[PDB]
């Protein structure tokens, strides 16, 4: 699971 650029916008 390399999806963390979804995630990331909202966990910065």
Known sequence: VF???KWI???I
């Open 9 to 11: 916008q909202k966990v």
């Open 3 to 5: 999806r963390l650029k």
